[PDB]
Design a protein around this nucleic acid. Structure first.
Ligand SMILES: [Mg+2]
Ligand SMILES: [Mg+2]
Ligand SMILES: [Mg+2]
Ligand SMILES: [Mg+2]
Ligand SMILES: [Mg+2]
Ligand SMILES: [Mg+2]
Ligand SMILES: [Mg+2]
Ligand SMILES: [Mg+2]
Ligand SMILES: [Mg+2]
Ligand SMILES: [Mg+2]
Ligand SMILES: [Mg+2]
Ligand SMILES: [Mg+2]
Ligand SMILES: [Mg+2]
Ligand SMILES: [Mg+2]
Ligand SMILES: [Mg+2]
Lengths: 97, 122, 206, 179, 149, 51, 32, 144
RNA sequence: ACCAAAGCUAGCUCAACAUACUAAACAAAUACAAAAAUACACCAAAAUAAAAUAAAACAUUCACCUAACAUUAAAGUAUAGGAGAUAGAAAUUUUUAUCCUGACGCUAUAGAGAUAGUACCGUAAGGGAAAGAUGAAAGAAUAAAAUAAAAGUAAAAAAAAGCAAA
């Protein structure tokens, strides 16, 4: 439980940088823009997670279906094993049934 | 157990394991079991005469160097054949079919020191 | 020959293969990495042998001559300006020769000074119309000559005497190459008169 | 002439022995092949003498007098060898057009890699060679999987190296806000 | 030469000639009492007895009579700081017996200088005198001698 | 089972590291007083009178 | 600061390269 | 006052050790009270070394003056002498300056004491001077 | 007071883009008992995935399980199933070009096993680690400052009687 004996360097974080000032600026692009673009298109990230949300099993299933043809050998094997384990646990284990 | 990182030399085996250390062979085995050495297989050092040679292993420190201009095939051709080709073309006797008189070797199988097969060590 | 260094290597104004550096950092050490500002060879304007001024430190405003530069840590050192005093002659029952050694300084703390007004200036690289790249000051607008410095060997070409195993300049610069289409082997054989009639047989390569 | 392995007897006990600078490529190229051939042995004798001196210094547990002479001689011999190799390469390019002085081929061994198999010199053709015939230059169908693992491993190494370099650049920019 | 491809020899082939040899040898002082006519060399591992005989007879013009070679194995017991064995390279040792009755004795390549010994003795005496004069006076009992009074 | 101690403080400088310094030592003084003054034997009885 | 240009959906027709092997087939079908 | 930086500025590298080495772990109370005879320059000497092209000039000054020196121990007890005694001392202070150096501060370099100078004041404590330590195979020799 | 304790870095992780994918070294030697220059050959081979598990047993069955078609729906629908557990489409529809890419991921028992597939352990296939911390300068070790905070000891062995406390 030994704790450090010196003051850590105080992080000089500013609230008025470019990212913090323009955070989510076009969140209402559709509503205020005569609908052409959903707020889905502003999400940057993995291809299988743009404008989508699910639990671990659904996320693994979607990843395997979408980008499973470009995964490495061990990555695909790990994804398959994780899918199998999640299927078994979710469909056969738990309390509330 | 035995080692695996160590080199597998001739000192690490039985009597029947007699591996060479990298020296080139110099003959064959004769009739009664002896080794017959071939004179032509032994290298002959072509050592020049250094008695009257006026150069030393080190250069003068104040001697200037030169800009690095590695010799290329284009420069070698310009130095050895371009003047002859130009003079012959001006004279009008140039023969494109025959180029052996200019140092060109159509086939390397004839001469002693071949270039592509590299018949000479050094 | 060159020495190899681990990526986690700290430079301490000592030769990497020197005994002092070896005793300071054994081969089994890997210290914390210090942040070094990336400055390229085309933007490093601090050379060895030029006069510079000191910005911050105990000797604020003093000028000195650069004696060494270390590009790995962006260090520049001047002779006898930023000094701490250390004893070099240490024995069991005797001490002495307390000499002032000098600490290294950064490029942000050392800036070049032009020889005209002897005042601090900012150096920017410019391309001259003559095909040369010479440092040009911006505060005044003048070029700074390259600070020629003697090499570490310790010999100057102006005073050199040839030994028994040195070639003369004329012999070294004499050109005797005749660019023909013969190999060194063929030329040596012809020169020494070695006659070989028989030729090699057919040799298969695979 | 067995004394040629040693320096002059008047320089034996001297602490420092001075010598000239090393030979350079331009100076070597300026010379003819006769002078190059002679200078090779001129440097060979000096290199043997310097090696003898270094070994004797190690044996006697004393520093070698000015050991830069061996480095200078090695550099000069390397420059001479480079010059001769350049001349031979230029001549063989002019005469045959082959870039490499030894025959070779881009083969694919049983491990799936692409290698540059150099050719050895034999007295019999390839189809009659006991030792050469049992070699295998091709990959079996079970090697594609390992080739894919090699590709993926190299890709992972390169990707994490790129990420490391990007993180280092960002950290340096944050640490030195000179913009 | 070494690290080069020797041309294949077949019946009637030309004699193999090497123009610029790649072999570098060292002359070493024997660690064991050898006869007067024996000279000890450390030679590259690719050199043979005939190669060394030609090397000595042609480059140096030495009338050699016999050559006997052996391979000395370098120790591989010393461990690095990573517990990895460090191997000293193996080397070939050759003994050359001269022919015409010439006797070779390895010279003293580091003769001690009387002037150098005298200078070293003078420096040692000066250092001892400096240490003696810097030694504190026992009668002072640790009180510094720099102050006047 | 084979861990060892470290940090054996030793000072051993040789002529090669003592002469292989790239930059030289920039002294600010000298070893001693060259041409050391020898005061005259009589000073105690001459310090009494100013002139 | 000044905000980046708004994301706008281009009204001009889009035609993927038929020679690209990586383009999806639904963008090359006649229904597209 | 134990001001090492200003002491380095004032005295030179040949004067700092001889005055700090054996005093770092003691307490000194040095005061200046009077100077009967003003310091007088005795001689000036110059040494030029052509290896580096550097010239050093030292000036010797004879000084007869009065201080009050009291050197204390690390435990706070008196060691050398009382604080109110104004003893007279005659010394020869030799200063050195590097003329080639653009800055060139005048720094104290050496302190010459005459061989015939009276012995310094005795210390307060007693001192034991042991004889030569003898191995069993050595017999003591009495000097006469 | 010893033993000790605290650094912030090495580097890792997850995605996007991407040239389009077995890196650099390959002088000589390397499938003779690998790193041994050199002799009349022989070379090549395919034939289903199984089971652990679920059906509370276990026999028919048991999604993913190293084979491309992605997304919004039709739809968990039609169907297939000891018609049980469970499995499960299709016809037909939607998907506007590029930058805006970094981190409400870890900081040396964490993050890759990794300082390294190295020491070491096995005949072999194979398994597989721990270990870094001063400072602008150690070319400032008669070296300078912060904690003297875990368990274990010493400073300082114990005096009838008892879950050690109230
Ligand atoms: Mg083993
Ligand atoms: Mg054996
Ligand atoms: Mg045996
Ligand atoms: Mg024989
Ligand atoms: Mg033998
Ligand atoms: Mg069951
Ligand atoms: Mg159950
Ligand atoms: Mg059962
Ligand atoms: Mg059961
Ligand atoms: Mg199954
Ligand atoms: Mg049925
Ligand atoms: Mg049932
Ligand atoms: Mg770890
Ligand atoms: Mg405790
Ligand atoms: Mg009780």
């Amino acid at each position: 439980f030994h704790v450090r004996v010196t003051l850590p360097p105080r992080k000089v974080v500013d609230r008025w940088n470019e990212k913090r000032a323009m955070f989510g600026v076009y969140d209402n692009i559709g509503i205020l823009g005569n609908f052409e673009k959903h707020p889905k298109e502003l999400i940057k990230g993995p291809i299988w997670l743009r404008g989508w949300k699910g639990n671990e099993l659904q996320r693994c299933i979607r990843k395997k279906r979408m980008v499973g043809n470009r995964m490495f050998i061990d990555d695909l094997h790990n994804l398959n094993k994780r899918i199998s384990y999640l299927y078994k646990h979710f469909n056969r284990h738990g309390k509330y049934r | 157990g035995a080692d695996r990182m160590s080199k597998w030399t001739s000192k690490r085996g039985p009597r029947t394991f007699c591996k060479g250390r990298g020296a080139k062979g110099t003959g064959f085995h004769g009739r009664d079991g002896k080794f017959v050495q071939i004179k032509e297989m032994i290298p002959e050092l072509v050592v020049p005469e250094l008695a009257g040679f006026k150069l030393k292993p080190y250069v003068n420190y104040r001697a200037p160097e030169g800009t690095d201009t590695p010799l290329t095939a284009k420069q070698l051709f310009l130095e050895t054949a371009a003047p002859a080709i130009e003079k012959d073309f001006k004279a009008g006797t140039f023969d494109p079919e025959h180029l052996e008189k200019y140092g060109f070797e159509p086939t390397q199988e004839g001469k002693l020191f071949q270039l592509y097969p590299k018949n000479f060590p050094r | 020959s060159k020495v190899t260094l681990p990526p986690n290597y700290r430079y301490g104004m000592s030769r990497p293969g020197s005994l002092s550096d070896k005793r300071k950092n054994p081969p089994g050490t890997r210290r914390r990495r210090v942040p070094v500002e990336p400055i390229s060879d085309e933007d490093w304007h601090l050379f060895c042998g030029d006069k510079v001024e000191i910005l911050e430190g105990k000797d604020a405003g003093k000028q000195g001559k650069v004696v060494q530069v270390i590009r790995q840590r962006n260090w520049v050192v001047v002779e006898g300006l930023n000094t701490h005093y250390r004893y070099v002659g240490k024995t069991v029952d005797y001490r002495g020769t307390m000499i002032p050694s000098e600490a290294p300084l950064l490029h942000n703390q050392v800036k070049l000074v032009d020889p005209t007004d002897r005042k601090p200036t900012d150096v920017e690289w410019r391309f001259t119309e003559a095909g040369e790249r010479v440092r040009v000051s911006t505060r005044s607008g003048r070029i700074i000559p390259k600070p020629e410095f003697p090499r570490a060997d310790g010999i100057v070409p102006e005073t050199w005497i040839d030994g028994p195993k040195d070639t003369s300049v004329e012999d070294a610069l004499e050109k005797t190459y005749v660019p023909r289409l013969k190999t060194l082997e063929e030329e040596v054989m012809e020169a020494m008169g070695i006659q070989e009639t028989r030729r090699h047989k057919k040799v298969y390569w695979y | 002439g067995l004394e040629e392995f040693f320096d002059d007897p008047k320089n034996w006990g001297e602490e420092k022995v001075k010598s000239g600078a090393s030979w350079t490529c331009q100076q070597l190229r300026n010379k003819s092949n006769e002078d190059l051939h002679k200078l090779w042995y001129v440097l060979l004798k000096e290199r043997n003498m310097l090696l003898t001196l270094e070994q004797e210094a190690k044996r006697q547990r004393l520093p070698m007098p000015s050991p830069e002479r061996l480095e200078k001689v090695v550099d000069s011999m390397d420059a001479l060898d480079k010059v001769v190799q350049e001349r031979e390469d230029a001549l063989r390019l002019l005469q045959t057009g082959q870039e490499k002085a030894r025959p070779g081929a881009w083969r694919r061994d049983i491990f799936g890699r692409i290698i540059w198999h150099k050719f050895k010199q034999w007295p019999i053709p390839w189809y009659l060679n006991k030792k050469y015939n049992r070699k295998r230059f091709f990959a079996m169908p079970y090697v594609e999987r390992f080739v894919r693992m090699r590709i993926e491993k190299q890709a992972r190494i390169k990707a994490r190296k790129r990420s490391l370099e990007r993180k280092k650049e960002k950290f340096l920019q944050e640490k030195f806000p000179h913009l | 030469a070494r690290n080069v491809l020797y041309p294949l020899y077949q019946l009637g082939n030309p004699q193999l000639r090497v123009f610029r040899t790649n072999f570098f040898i060292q002359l070493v002082r024997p660690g064991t009492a050898q006869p007067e006519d024996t000279v000890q060399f450390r030679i590259p591992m690719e050199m043979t007895r005939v190669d060394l005989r030609n090397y000595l007879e042609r480059i140096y013009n030495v009338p050699v009579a016999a050559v006997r070679t052996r391979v000395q194995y370098g120790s591989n017991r010393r461990r690095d700081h990573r517990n990895i064995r460090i191997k000293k390279p193996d080397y070939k040792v050759a003994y050359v017996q001269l022919a015409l009755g010439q006797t070779f004795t390895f010279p003293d390549l580091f003769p001690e200088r009387k002037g150098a010994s005298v200078d070293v003795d003078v420096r040692d005496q000066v250092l001892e005198d400096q240490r003696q004069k810097h030694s504190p006076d026992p009668r002072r009992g640790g009180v510094p001698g720099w102050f006047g009074l | 089972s084979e861990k060892e101690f470290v940090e054996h403080a030793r000072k051993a400088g040789l002529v090669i590291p003592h002469e292989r310094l790239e930059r030289p030592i920039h002294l600010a003084c000298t070893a001693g007083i060259f041409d050391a003054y020898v005061p005259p034997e009589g000073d105690a009885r001459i310090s009494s009178l100013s002139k | 600061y000044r905000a980046r240009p708004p994301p706008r959906r281009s009204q001009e027709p889009r035609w993927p390269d038929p020679d690209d092997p990586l383009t999806p087939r639904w963008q090359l079908s006649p229904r597209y | 006052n134990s001001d090492h930086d200003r002491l380095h500025t004032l005295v030179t590298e040949n004067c700092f050790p001889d005055m700090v080495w054996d005093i770092r772990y003691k307490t000194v109370r040095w005061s200046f009270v009077e100077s009967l005879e003003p310091p007088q320059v005795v001689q000036v000497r110059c040494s030029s070394l052509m290896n580096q092209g550097n010239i050093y000039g030292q000036v010797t000054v004879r000084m007869h003056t009065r201080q009050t020196l009291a050197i204390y121990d690390r435990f706070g007890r008196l060691m050398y002498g009382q604080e109110d005694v104004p003893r007279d001392v005659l010394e020869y202070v030799v200063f050195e300056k590097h003329l080639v150096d653009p800055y060139g501060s005048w720094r104290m370099h050496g302190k010459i004491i005459p061989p015939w100078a009276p012995p310094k004041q005795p210390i307060l404590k007693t001192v034991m001077i042991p004889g030569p330590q003898l191995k069993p195979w050595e017999e003591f020799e009495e000097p006469q």
